[PDB]
Design a protein around this nucleic acid. Structure first.
Lengths: 61, 188, 283, 225, 98, 133, 116, 60
RNA sequence: UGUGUGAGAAGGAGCUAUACAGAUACAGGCGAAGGAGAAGCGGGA
RNA sequence: UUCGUUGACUGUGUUUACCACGGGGAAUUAGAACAGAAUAUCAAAAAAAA
């Protein structure tokens, strides 16, 4: 695809956003991806979620 | 030259007299059928018994024993074939790039047939020696160990083989007889 | 050797159901296609020649020969064939039971059977050659030692000996000899295939080179002619870069104008998959 | 001629042809000629099973239905009749250990091993084999080959001194073959490097070659434990 | 036990090994044979030598016809040692051969 | 699936459960004896073996017993094998294969006709093993 | 002279046209039972030697079903998505299950045509 | 080597009257050459007469 | 987010209303594997 | 495997693809619910003197 993809979490689920070159440009794409990464950093969407049961042995698959 | 000729395989009717006569005979046909169906016992009624219950149990036991022993015997070998097989691929993949093409060929490798108009590594045509033949090299010893029934079956097998291939020699010596023009073939 | 104009016979008729004429049922598409389903051809509509001494007669003789040789030899050969193809590597011994000290004929076979839950009846059924292909394959390749002897023994009077007394070390011999005669190259077919493809040996990436002694320096020098590094690289790997100019013209020019700048079709087909020996990775 | 042996093993005497190298290692070829036993033997269980089945079949009247019209065909080969009617050089010889698998071995000077030969640049391995067979073994010697692919290979590196010549080492590719029954023995030519030859069993094999050499082909030979 | 090719060759299985090697047949469906008027239940096991007289023929290689036994498709041949402990202990009485 | 493999492969002191023929992938069928009692964590031994196998240059695809037993049927396993294989053999879009999406038939709320693996469907008759990701 | 009048000559002509093609664009809410793409089982001769686009059919993607006439229909409440295939050079329709809600301009990226 | 290539054959098929497309690029030929400047139709008889006149003028 | 669309007595060699209770529906299962050579049987499960 | 079967069943409901209407009928979903009778496939079997 020739695209800069950035991963992030949303609604307790993983996801990603692409940035094609053919839209922005050679140079612009990377800038936009890093700017979006900064916004996700500020919003706290990069933190991985977790699930706990409170009982030893019982887990989630 | 004729400039226009195309032959196709053909089997003359006169050369196949043995086979034809064997087949057309009803007495022989019946016998053949009988041989194919060894038991030939009725199998279409409840009041039928091939063997009593006591007879089958011994058969079962013997069979079981036989199998049990043979598996044990054979496993040892199997491991060896496995092991051996492991190495061949290793050596093949280790060869240079130019010699790879020759390392993926069969024993019976031959060039493609060329239909020329009318007037490397491959040196010799594949020809399996007769000497190497299992039967060839151990027939005399086995023959003497054959039983009455075994001999009988051997005889019958010989007979049937002969019947099936009467003109083997004929074909070998005069292959041209087994050929007819395409126009004659496609208008029989 | 014999030489004669073999010629080529006409293709056989396949036939079809008496339904559908305006459309084209011959599209050359993969079977079971979710978008381009393939029309079915019932077996009963395929034209067949009447049964005679030629078609049926010789099948009887072949079946009688197989009955005399015994179906157990055919089942053993089948078993062997099936087993040999899945145990190409050293394997830990496997037991048929959870406990005890028994053994098995083959580990790979055992595993396969246990997994697939292969019917016991179907194993026996096959050995009788119900179909015509099973009889033709027995006629061409029927010897016990066929893995070793090819079809050499296809016309041997004394062939039942092999099927009767060929157990033990002799058996092992066959297995040993066959592996060195099996094919290992690439396959080239068109028709549908439903089976696991045979193993294919990989090709190396390190070609050889020729050298010769030289007394002027008491050393071995390469026989190849010295050239520019660029040339050397070009010849070895290929053109440098993502793209290059087209190939030159070999043949003389055309005496008259020809519209050679037009493609074969308005819409070229999709690219075909790559088929061939694989590259060997450094160990 | 010791010159041929030295040109084979070491690189001091240059040859009269261009050698084929592979990553600094020269490609080589070998051969191993083996013979099948002469006397047939059968397992124990096999006999038992056979006997039992025969007996059972006979008893139960479940045997094959062999007609008199088929088993009594007048043919030249006919030898069949009813029993009722019947009443009216200690290591070079090829006949050593009939019930064993004999392997061929050659002696280079004072070392027992398999034949060896280098590969000419541009030539095939079968050609090399052919030449080997026709020059070292015998002029009329031509054993039956089992295939085109090898079964085993090894590596051999030269000391730190001879490495300055240009060749780092050697590359051997072992091959297997069979001896056609009824053929004559070997005939070493006058200008061959082999000094002697002998046929040995699996058991006695280790007593001639080094373990190093043994291991390289131990996984390709027949099992006779 | 065995530890070499010769020992393998001259191996002498014990009665326990033979019992483990004993063949058994398992049913699939709860069908009634139209021929013999014999009912069948799922999960049951029987001896091959007494499960069906007619099927044995085919199984052993004395019948070219596969249709000899209507309930033949409903058979599963296994070894005694392959069977679970539960099954063994349950149908132990029906598997004896004394 | 039309994939060539070897069962119980020997590579020295290590024994591999399933070894592929075409591609460098080893499928591990973990059992209950490979985990502690009343827990969901691997043991030191198996960890070490995993480490070694990775070092060797061979990809390892784990398969826990509780995940296999849940997929009672063959339809739920046929697509899972494909998915798993893909996830391992993929070269593009490298990331942690932990929080990945999963949707199999008869477990997740989905249409019955929503298939992934067509019955006897192969483009150009090319095996799954040979198919390039 | 002479002339044979074709059976399809005026006024006897085909009034209903084969409206074959896509029926739902990208970012279009759909529900089960709606036909996404219409197709025909009839195939002409020499398909590989034509310029027209209607002679080529699309393959199913995600949450789609194939009908009797090879029509692609949806199977869940969602939006239509298109995708290209490199291995085959054929488009594939995909449906993403989504609930009924306002479509924001910042979520348009989710429905982009990608290559697989 | 030199060859005497056979000329094409007339197509006995009815075709539209569509326009004449333009040229792709200049055609370069060694030696003397005669070219047109504008598009138009030319008949086989016209071409044959031109060939006969050219052959008669140039010689054998 | 880029597709549908053959009007004029225009061209072409369009054209057939038909099959199946099943080796033509059909669960599960199986299913075609280069070249050379043997056979002269238009045979995949 | 030369393997099974008749589901090509019987009822309740007025929501949906296209749209002059007609024939939802060049031929669309589990209207994923409810009331009967049939056929096919099960699942599990770990730990081998350290």
């Amino acid at each position: 695809n020739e695209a800069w993809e950035v991963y992030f979490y949303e609604n307790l689920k993983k996801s990603a956003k692409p940035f094609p070159v053919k839209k922005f440009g050679i140079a612009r794409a990377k800038r936009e991806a890093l700017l979006f990464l900064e916004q996700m950093k500020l919003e706290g969407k990069l933190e991985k979620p977790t699930f706990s049961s409170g009982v030893d042995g019982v887990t989630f698959d | 030259p004729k400039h226009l000729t195309r032959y196709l395989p053909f089997v003359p009717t006169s050369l196949v007299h043995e086979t034809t006569s064997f087949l057309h005979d009803a007495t022989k046909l019946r016998a053949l059928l009988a041989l194919i169906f060894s038991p030939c016992k009725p199998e279409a009624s409840v009041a039928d018994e091939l063997a009593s219950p006591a007879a089958r149990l011994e058969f079962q036991q013997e069979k079981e024993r036989y199998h049990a022993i043979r598996d044990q015997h054979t496993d040892c070998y199997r491991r060896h074939e496995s092991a051996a097989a492991a190495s061949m691929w290793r050596a093949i993949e280790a060869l240079p790039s130019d010699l790879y093409e020759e390392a993926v060929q069969s024993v019976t490798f031959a060039p493609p047939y060329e239909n020329e108009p009318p007037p490397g590594f491959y040196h010799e045509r594949f020809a399996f020696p007769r000497a190497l033949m299992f039967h060839e090299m151990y027939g005399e010893q086995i023959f003497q160990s054959l039983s009455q029934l075994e001999r009988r079956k051997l005889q019958v097998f010989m007979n049937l083989m002969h019947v099936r291939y009467p003109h083997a020699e004929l074909k070998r010596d005069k292959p041209a007889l087994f050929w007819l023009p395409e126009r004659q073939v496609l208008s029989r | 050797p014999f030489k004669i104009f073999k010629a080529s016979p006409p293709p056989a008729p396949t036939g079809r159901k008496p339904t559908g004429y305006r459309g084209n049922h011959w599209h050359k598409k993969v079977l079971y296609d979710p978008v381009y389903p393939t029309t079915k051809v019932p077996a009963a509509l395929v034209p067949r020649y009447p049964i005679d001494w030629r078609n049926g007669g010789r099948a009887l003789l072949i079946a009688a020969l197989s009955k005399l040789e015994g179906a157990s030899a055919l089942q053993r050969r089948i078993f062997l064939r099936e087993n040999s193809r899945e145990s190409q590597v050293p394997q830990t011994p496997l037991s048929p039971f959870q406990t005890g000290s028994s053994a098995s004929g083959g580990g790979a076979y055992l595993v396969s059977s246990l997994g697939r839950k292969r019917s016991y009846v179907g194993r026996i059924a096959v050995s009788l050659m119900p179909r015509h292909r099973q009889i033709a394959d027995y006629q061409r390749v029927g010897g016990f030692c066929s893995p070793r002897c090819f079809s050499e023994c296809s016309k041997e009077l004394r062939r039942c000996l092999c099927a009767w007394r060929c157990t033990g070390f002799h058996e092992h011999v066959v297995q040993m000899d066959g592996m060195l005669g099996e094919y290992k190259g690439e396959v080239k077919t068109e028709k549908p295939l439903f089976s696991v493809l045979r193993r294919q040996a990989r090709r190396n990436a390190d070609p050889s080179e020729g050298v010769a002694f030289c007394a002027e320096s008491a050393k071995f020098k390469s026989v190849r002619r010295a050239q520019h590094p660029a040339f050397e690289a070009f010849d070895r790997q290929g053109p440098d870069g993502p793209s290059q100019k087209p190939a030159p013209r070999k043949e003389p020019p055309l005496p008259f104008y020809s519209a050679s700048h037009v493609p074969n079709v308005p819409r070229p087909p999709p690219p075909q998959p790559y088929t061939g020996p694989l590259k060997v990775r450094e160990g | 001629g010791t010159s041929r042996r030295l040109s084979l093993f070491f690189s001091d005497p240059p040859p009269a042809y261009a050698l084929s190298l592979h990553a600094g290692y020269k490609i080589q070829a070998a051969l191993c000629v083996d013979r099948l036993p002469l006397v047939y033997r059968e397992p124990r269980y096999e006999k038992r099973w056979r006997e039992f089945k025969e007996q059972w079949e006979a008893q139960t009247k479940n045997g094959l239905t062999l007609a008199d019209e088929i088993t009594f065909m007048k043919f030249p080969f006919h030898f069949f009749e009813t029993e009722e009617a019947q009443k009216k050089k200690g290591l070079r010889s090829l006949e050593r250990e009939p019930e064993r698998t004999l392997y061929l071995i050659v002696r280079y000077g004072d070392s027992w091993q398999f034949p060896l030969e280098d590969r000419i640049h541009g030539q095939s391995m079968r050609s090399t084999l052919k030449r080997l067979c026709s020059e070292q073994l015998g002029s009329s010697y031509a054993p039956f080959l089992l295939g085109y692919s090898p079964f085993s290979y090894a590596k051999r590196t030269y000391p730190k001194k001879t490495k300055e010549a240009g060749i780092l080492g050697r590359k051997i590719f072992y091959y297997r073959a069979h001896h056609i029954p009824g053929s004559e023995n070997l005939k070493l030519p006058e200008g061959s490097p082999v000094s002697d030859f002998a046929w040995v069993t699996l058991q006695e094999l280790p007593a001639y070659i080094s373990p190093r050499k043994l291991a390289a082909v131990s996984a390709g030979l027949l099992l006779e434990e | 036990t065995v530890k070499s090719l010769a020992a393998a060759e001259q191996w002498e299985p014990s009665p326990l090994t033979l019992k483990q090697h004993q063949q058994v047949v398992v049913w699939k469906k709860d069908r009634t044979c139209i021929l013999c008027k014999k009912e069948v239940q799922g999960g049951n096991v029987e001896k091959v030598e007494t499960a069906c007289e007619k099927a044995w023929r085919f199984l052993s290689g004395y019948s070219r016809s596969a249709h000899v036994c209507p309930i033949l498709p409903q058979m599963r041949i296994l070894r005694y040692g392959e069977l679970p402990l539960r099954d063994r202990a349950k149908f132990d009485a029906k598997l004896r051969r004394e | 699936l039309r994939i060539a493999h070897f069962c119980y492969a020997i590579r020295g002191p290590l024994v591999f459960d399933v070894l592929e023929r075409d591609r460098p992938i080893v499928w591990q069928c973990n059992t209950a004896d490979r985990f502690y009692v009343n827990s969901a964590e691997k043991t030191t031994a198996v960890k070490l073996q995993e480490r070694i196998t990775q070092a060797m240059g061979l990809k390892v695809g784990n398969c826990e017993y509780w995940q296999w037993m849940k997929m009672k049927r063959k339809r739920t396993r046929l697509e899972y094998i494909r998915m798993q294989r893909y996830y391992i053999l993929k070269d593009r879009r490298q990331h942690d294969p932990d929080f990945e999406g999963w949707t199999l038939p008869l477990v997740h709320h989905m249409h019955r006709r929503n298939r992934l693996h067509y019955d006897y469907y192969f483009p150009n008759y090319t095996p799954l093993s040979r198919v390039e990701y | 002279a002479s002339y044979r009048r074709p059976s399809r000559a005026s006024p006897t002509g085909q009034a209903r046209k084969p409206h074959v093609g896509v029926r739902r664009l990208a970012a279009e809410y759909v529900w089960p039972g709606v036909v996404l793409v219409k197709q025909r089982k009839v195939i002409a001769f020499n398909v590989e030697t034509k310029r027209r686009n209607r002679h080529f059919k699309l393959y199913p993607g995600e949450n789609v079903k194939v009908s009797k006439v090879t029509n692609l229909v949806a199977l869940c409440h969602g939006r239509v998505k298109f995708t290209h295939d490199v291995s085959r050079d054929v488009l594939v329709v995909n449906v993403l299950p989504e609930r009924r809600e306002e479509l924001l301009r910042e979520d348009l990226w989710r429905y982009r045509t990608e290559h697989v | 080597p030199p060859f005497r290539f056979k000329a094409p054959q007339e197509v006995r098929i009815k075709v539209p009257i569509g326009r004449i497309p333009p040229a792709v690029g200049p055609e370069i030929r060694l030696g003397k050459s005669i070219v047109a400047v504008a598009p138009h139709r030319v008949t086989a008889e016209q071409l044959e007469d031109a060939r006969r006149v050219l052959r008669r003028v140039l010689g054998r």
